[PDB]
Ligand binder design. Structure first.
Ligand SMILES: Nc1ncnc2c1ncn2[C@@H]1O[C@H](CN(CC[C@H](N)C(=O)O)C(=O)Nc2ncnc3nc[nH]c23)[C@@H](O)[C@H]1O
Lengths: 199, 234
């Protein structure tokens, strides 16, 4: 079911096996640099979410190393690394421990052998205006769509502005639950017949 | 405007559209710079321990196969005894390319005892000319230089035009970032070339056509009272 879907929940406690498999997984975790500890990050059940496809993992500070650990622990090889150069409304780098930071990093991991992906269409540098705090640029959805058109995708730790067609967005600041894919709605009812996601 | 869509449409990399006091510091650096020193040496067959004294800054620029499209593999780079020529407090800048080096370069930094404080990234524009690794998902338009610290004004971006094919030179801007940190005056550039020789720096590399390095002459520059100068000092 093509239109935006989402689940308000705590990604630590949701039974993500009800969601199926995804061609692309994207994630913008609250690394401890409301955060999640390194073992909580390590323990997330990313491995069940895909058989073949790509993981896009935003990282910063020591998460550049830690996210490489999770990415390998979850079963991925890191094959690329996107750099978002943060500009203002006039295309100047905004700046802002040893060097000011002009950019944020997004690790690209492969799992399995994904086929039919349009590798090569975009390049590994995004130039896009900064917005709210920790708000990533919408350009990433275009590149991901051009890479894997029409396939189902999952975002972790999204806010409402992250909801996107062909995606299922998970976060604890989403307005409730909104599921349309019938296969998911089925498995969600069975696993959550009263609608509460705890433990 | 979506520059990623623009690039797909036109071949103009998003970085093409990025737009846009310290001289006294630059002059202080230039005064306290040691004479340039340099030494031809095959670093594979070379006991780097012969390189003394111990260094405050190490710039490391091994010739990676990906730069050409003797190369060094990350296997060969991981085996360098960098920890034996670094001072207890010291810094490293390691050119890692844009592929597996981004992961193997980190292992190296830990291998030699550093932790990564900064990820300096060289973004290459293609304004003058609007190729793929098999494992690659996207077109590679940047290179990474990882900064490591061990022991107790500038930005982390360098933007220049993509050099000619077969030009393996890295942007001389990295030297300004390094020297503006004021990290010490013993600076070693491993795998430098004739074209990278530079005051304030000792260059060791297999292609250098001449050498002037002398271990005792070099240490003469740092004997007291000059032991602990930052390099930004009178
Ligand atoms: N176990 C958990 N389970 C489910 N959701 C969780 C959670 N744990 C935290 N979340 C939620 O993940 C989302 C993280 N986002 C939205 C990020 C999104 N990529 C964007 O582009 O905007 C975010 O902006 N985080 C922030 N990081 C630092 N400084 C900030 N200042 C204000 N927000 C800040 C939040 O909604 C959070 O409640």
């Amino acid at each position: 079911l093509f239109p935006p879907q989402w689940i308000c929940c705590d990604i630590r406690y949701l039974d993500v096996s009800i969601l199926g498999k995804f061609a692309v997984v994207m994630a913008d975790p609250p690394w401890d640099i409301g955060t999640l500890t390194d073992d909580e990050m390590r323990r997330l059940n990313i491995p069940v979410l895909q058989d073949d496809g790509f993981l896009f993992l935003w990282v910063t500070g020591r998460a550049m190393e830690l996210g490489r650990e999770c990415l390998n622990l979850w079963g991925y090889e890191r094959v690329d690394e996107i750099i978002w150069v943060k500009t203002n409304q006039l295309q100047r780098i905004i700046r802002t421990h040893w060097l000011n930071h002009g950019k944020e990093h997004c690790l690209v991991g492969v799992k399995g052998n994904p086929q039919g992906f349009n590798q090569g269409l975009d390049c590994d540098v995004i130039v896009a205006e900064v917005r709210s705090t920790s708000h990533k640029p919408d350009e990433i959805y275009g590149m991901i769509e051009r890479l894997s058109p029409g396939t189902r995708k999952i975002e972790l730790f999204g806010r409402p502005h992250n909801v996107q067609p062909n995606w299922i967005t998970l976060g604890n600041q989403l307005d409730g639950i909104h599921l349309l894919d019938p296969d998911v709605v089925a498995r969600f009812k069975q696993r959550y017949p009263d609608g509460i996601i705890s433990k | 405007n979506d520059y990623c869509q623009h690039f797909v449409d036109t071949g103009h990399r998003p970085q093409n559209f990025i737009r846009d006091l310290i001289r006294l510091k630059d002059e202080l650096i230039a005064k306290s710079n040691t004479p340039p020193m340099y030494l031809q040496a095959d670093i594979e067959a070379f006991d780097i321990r012969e390189l003394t004294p111990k260094f405050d800054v190490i710039l490391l620029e091994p010739p990676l196969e990906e730069y050409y499209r003797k190369c060094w593999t990350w296997d060969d780079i991981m085996k360098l005894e960098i920890d034996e020529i670094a001072a207890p407090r010291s810094f490293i800048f390691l050119w890692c390319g844009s592929g597996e080096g981004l992961d193997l370069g980190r292992v190296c930094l830990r291998k030699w005892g550093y932790r990564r404080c900064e990820d300096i990234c060289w973004i290459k524009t293609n304004k003058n000319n609007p190729t793929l690794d098999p494992k690659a998902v996207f077109q590679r338009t940047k290179e990474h230089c990882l900064m490591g610290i061990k022991g107790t004004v500038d930005i982390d971006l360098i933007i220049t035009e993509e050099p000619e094919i077969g030009n393996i030179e890295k942007p001389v801007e990295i030297f300004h970032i390094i020297e503006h940190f004021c990290l010490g005056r013993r600076r070693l550039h491993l795998f430098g070339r004739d074209s990278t020789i530079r005051p304030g720096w000792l260059t060791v590399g297999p292609t250098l056509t001449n050498s002037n390095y002398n271990a005792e002459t070099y240490a003469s520059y740092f004997s007291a009272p000059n032991s602990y100068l930052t390099g930004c000092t009178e």
